[PDB]
């Protein structure tokens, strides 16, 4: 089953690469700390958490687009991941 288009840009909103795969995107894997891009959702909601796979800042995003680059999570270095649902 597939019914959720997730469009996220892998960079700034004025010169970056975007992708909208309708079959589970690569997601967050090569994260770290120096992350800067924009997020766009147009179907349901997801759960964004920057930490280990067992406990972290649980923050789900809903209908809306944003482009943070100094508030989301830029401490120094750490792990992060989000489930595209």
Q: Is 78 among the annotated ligand-binding positions?
A: yes
In the numeric block, which tokens belong to residue 51? Answer: 């930490």
35 is in an annotated binding site: yes
How many Cα atoms sit within 13 Å of 80 on the Cβ side?
22
38 is in an annotated binding site: no
Residue carrying structure tokens 């508030």:
71
Cβ atoms 36, 11 nearer than 8 A: yes
50 marked ligand binding residue: yes
Binding site as annotated, residues for Ca(2+): 10, 34-35, 37, 50, 77-78, 80
Detail the residues annotated as belonging to a binding site: 10, 34-35, 37, 50, 77-78, 80
Binding-site members for Mg(2+) are: 10, 34-35, 37, 50, 77-78, 80
């Amino acid at each position: 089953m597939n019914a959720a288009e997730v469009i996220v840009y892998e960079h700034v909103n004025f010169g970056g690469k975007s992708f909208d795969a309708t079959s589970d995107q690569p997601g967050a894997g090569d994260n770290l700390n120096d992350k800067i891009s924009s997020i766009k959702v147009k179907s349901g909601t997801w759960r964004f958490y920057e930490y280990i796979n067992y406990g972290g800042r649980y923050w789900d995003l809903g209908p809306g687009e944003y482009s943070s680059v100094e508030s989301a999570g830029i401490p120094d270095n750490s792990i992060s991941s989000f489930r595209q649902i």
